[PDB]
Amino acid sequence: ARVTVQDAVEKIGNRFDLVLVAARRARQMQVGGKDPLVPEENDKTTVIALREIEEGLINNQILDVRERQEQQEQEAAELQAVT
């Protein structure tokens, strides 16, 4: 359900970091076991990542901010567990 990504590159810019962020998001869905926020109407990871880019929910900034938050919360949970 995606044939033109012009509205996606206009959202991200430079047409290059969009590929990297979409690849990271698709890897998060596929091997990372993440939950696709947008509805999944029988599609695989890459187009869910592209549509999430389109809707503006995910970009580079939100992605690494969420990654840092997950890292710090899991570190806190681990240190609580060992203590």
Partner: protein, 1355 residues
Amino acid sequence: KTEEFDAIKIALASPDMIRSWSFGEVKKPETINYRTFKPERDGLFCARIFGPVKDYECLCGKYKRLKHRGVICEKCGVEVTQTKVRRERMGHIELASPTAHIWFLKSLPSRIGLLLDMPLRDIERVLYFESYVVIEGGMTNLERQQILTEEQYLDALEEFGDEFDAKMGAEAIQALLKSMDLEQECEQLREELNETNSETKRKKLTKRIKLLEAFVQSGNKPEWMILTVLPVLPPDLRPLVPLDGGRFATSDLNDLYRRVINRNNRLKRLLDLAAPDIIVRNEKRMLQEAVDALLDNGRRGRAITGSNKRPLKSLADMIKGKQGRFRQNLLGKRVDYSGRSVITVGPYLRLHQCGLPKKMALELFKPFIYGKLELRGLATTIKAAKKMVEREEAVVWDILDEVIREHPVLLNRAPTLHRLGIQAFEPVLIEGKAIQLHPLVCAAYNADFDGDQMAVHVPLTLEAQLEARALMMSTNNILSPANGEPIIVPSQDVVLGLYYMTRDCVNAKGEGMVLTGPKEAERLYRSGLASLHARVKVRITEYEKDANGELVAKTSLKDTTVGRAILWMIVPKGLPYSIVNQALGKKAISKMLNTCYRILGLKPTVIFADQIMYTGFAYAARSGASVGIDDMVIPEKKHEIISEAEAEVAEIQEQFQSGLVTAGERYNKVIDIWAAANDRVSKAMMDNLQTETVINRDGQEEKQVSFNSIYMMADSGARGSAAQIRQLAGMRGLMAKPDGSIIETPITANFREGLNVLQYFISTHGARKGLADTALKTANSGYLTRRLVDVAQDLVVTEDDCGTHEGIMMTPVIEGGDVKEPLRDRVLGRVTAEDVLKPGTADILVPRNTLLHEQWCDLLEENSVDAVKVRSVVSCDTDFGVCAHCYGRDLARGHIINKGEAIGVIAAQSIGEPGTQLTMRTFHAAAESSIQVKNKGSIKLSNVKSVVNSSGKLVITSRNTELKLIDEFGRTKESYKVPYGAVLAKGDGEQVAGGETVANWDPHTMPVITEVSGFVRFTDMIDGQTITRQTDELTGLSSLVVLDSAERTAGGKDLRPALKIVDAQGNDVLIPGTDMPAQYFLPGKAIVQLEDGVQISSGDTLARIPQESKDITGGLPRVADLFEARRPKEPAILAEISGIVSFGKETKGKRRLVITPVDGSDPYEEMIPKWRQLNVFEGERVERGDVISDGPEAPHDILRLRGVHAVTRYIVNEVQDVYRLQGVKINDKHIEVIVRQMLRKATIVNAGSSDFLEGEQVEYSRVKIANRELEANGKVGATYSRDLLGITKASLATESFISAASFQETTRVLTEAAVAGKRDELRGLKENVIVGRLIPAGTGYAYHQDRMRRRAAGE
């Protein structure tokens, strides 16, 4: 060891390192035993030296399991490890005698010869065991480096005893190299070069100094150039392929190694037995020949052949070459998950879709199907999945359908020329055995459905899939990267259908009806109550875009045709109705698509394109257009016309029978008459065809555009042209002989009617000419494309803005009489270099750094601005890459160019792709004197010194005078070059009308124009000695002619004639301009009618010097000449400085020119050939860059005399002229990028504080960095002169040795890098491709900059 990969370091390999690499020593020339497959000990293939035979298994069977991994056996001494160890394990052959390396000996210049400073022939004779060389002759007459013959050696032995040392061969060379002192020779040569100041000593001594410095700086020793222990290839790299049966496939490398080992063993045996000197000498010579064969077969003489009676392959031969390992299995390699198949057209496919066969999809996506089946649980293991796949159930088909859902596949053509050659599609399962392809994209691939085969590749990783969805997609590729025009364009049946949907009749069924909307029009058409060509009135609700982008609907009762109403259904809600109310030709469709893309965007545009394709196909099918023999109407007058033409030619022929006219004039008149007859016939046929149909319209008859099918294809532009229809129903025309001469008689019969044998035979000449032209054109186009790609591989965008305030000039190109290209398209998409000022008001029309879009171009052209300074890649100050701002707007996408794009490859491919359009073969004069203007405008004279004449008309005295007709708006419209000594109708600033003769001048002679009025005094000319009063009986007068220098005496040639202007009294006029006396030095061979003591006014023609009164290059050869900077056969001599020109004494029968400056001394007394005419006079104040003589320009000369901007302008203008003459379009930025890559080397002028050598040539970026650093530290910066190099030469001279080796030349750059110890950083696209890491152009730019910042942080 990927992190270990940062650079490649090469050098000469010492014998110690060679021994360290080897795991053993090969002794016997044997291979694996034929009786038993186990390899023989100490042979070419071995087990103790190299790795074992099978994984984790001992040769003797002591251990056969991983339990004893990494354990050395003792029964046979074979390491227990994997078989792959056989690929990185080497051995060493211990040569009995030293041998020279052949790359450092035969690859010119000879490194051994250059280092030893001896002739190559002497080195070769000494090396091959036939001539003797002295090592140390002592205090006797025998010098250090002296060549001795056998008899001379014996004589010296008896005369001077045994104190002198004269060895035999490579041992002597090695001893001499060891005895040489590097630093002492370096300093001695340095001081000799300092105090020699001789041109022959200027050269070949800097090279020696550079070689000495390279040897000293690196760890390489000269003696290492002489091989003593040689390495062998790992056994797996020269495998013995098991042929069918007991036969084993022969390997050339194995045979060569066996030969070398046998030779070494024989030499060892002979040395051990103390053989006579002759026998061991011959053995050493033939060992050297074997080493020649192994290192590089056929380099010296005959190549050692084998059972095939043809030369064998050694290391060097298959390292280099087209089939060599460097460019056959390294730069491009076969890949898995790939297929190929013939293609067919499919109309039911969307723009982003392709048709894949079921078998191809099943085979290509096999691992994905296996994984999905394993996930589904249908197959427990991989073997079960394989069995299910080969059984072809329905579940495997469903799994395949799920897999392909949004997995794009890449399709490409075998001759991928331009960037759009490969594109990805979303495949869909289809039946059949052929790949269904979208019709619109076919023109992108340049692939007609006549048997062409597509190749398909399948990405797997997520990054590759996103590349497929983002950049490989065809939807994103809408604008061409060469000129920005749309790549997808409706063509053929589609547009034809639209034509049939827009043509209007007069009495068609349903005329006069009034409909409420397109829906009722469709109802009426489908019900059969009306015809598509009927003219009606319908209520159209046009939706238009207003402020804030909102849609406003306006309903109006317009008058149109029902077919246009049907077409309006698929038009989106942004376009106006006027875009449809036309005849809908091909150009109309293209304009409508462009407007739709500009207004509504790409997303509606793709759907609109799909809809128009569907509608055009359907209505072309419904139209039922067909071609018939009756549709081909021959004009009735044509025959009559031919008759009269014959009559005409007969009359002309009669004149040649009467002697009134000559044969040449007869032929010319015949050609002109036949051309006029052809034009008349074509006009009559076109008038017949265009409006043949006559129709009743409820009354009297009336005319309308004809419905003839051939006329439909001609007018709609679907396929065919006016020339082809002229050949079809008019006449074939004047055909040409293969040499180029036009045949006297034309083909007077149509293609519809019969052609006689002679006319067909005549046409076959041109047919074969064109076919052979294309056949030979393909290869040259491919070679040029490869060279251009190699030249511009490194250039990528690395920065945003340079901040440089320097840019190239931009003015519309005018060749005289027409403007070939307006300013708008040449300056479109280029960032302005500086502020663009309004003409005459000193107001900032355009700011300093703005991207010039369409609105800015409209504003620029509205204010009548013709000159714009724009930033160019040539002036891009960024080193190792270009900035985004300097390059300008990307052609494919309207936005500014993004960082990282490898514009060099884009430029190379865009320039290469029209190569098939150009023609290489040369094709096939007219003389004009007076200049006539075409438009009416003001007149302007530039670089002009003019003198008034007796009649008051101006006369040009300047060589480089330019005449320009400028429009009333202030823009130049005409530009011509007026030669020296031309009369002018009017002065500067007077309005003139079109067609007026502005200037006239003598075609075959140059007059001598005096600036003063007075009597002429015959000074410094004497009859016979200097001039001859040659008597012309036809004129009846004896006119003085200036003799040639050889004709003149010594005093006569020294006393060349000098026309001095005096007054009536007799003293010199002395010129009003300057105080030096009025002297007009007559040049050689000048003929003067004027006699002594004749009064002449200012501007009078003193004398006339005759001159001679043809260059045909072509399309491809001219482009190759321009790009490789080949020196023209007749380079025009230009002044290196500004000063007075003077003649010197003739040297070797040729002329000496001296240019004396006003202040400095004359540096240049360069020699001039006598046969080459000189445009300049004896005494003229010529400026630097002016043409001393007339001839083709040399780009190197332009670079030395003038700035790099002049060279860039010249190259761009020439290449663009050649490209536009063929009709194709290429943007100038690609040519500018190629030129910038060409100008990358600079020669130092003064060393300064930098360490750069005085005469060395280095990269320009290094000079810039060094100068900036020195300025920062306050030291004086080194001065540089940019040099122009050929594209092949520039590519071969790059810093990266790997990229240079990837080019054509090999074993020359490799040898230079080895002797120089060059270290290559992986900073290029080609180098990284050879590596296999991510290229630093695309998405790998982020990874590469991340690596660079990580390295910087580590430092």
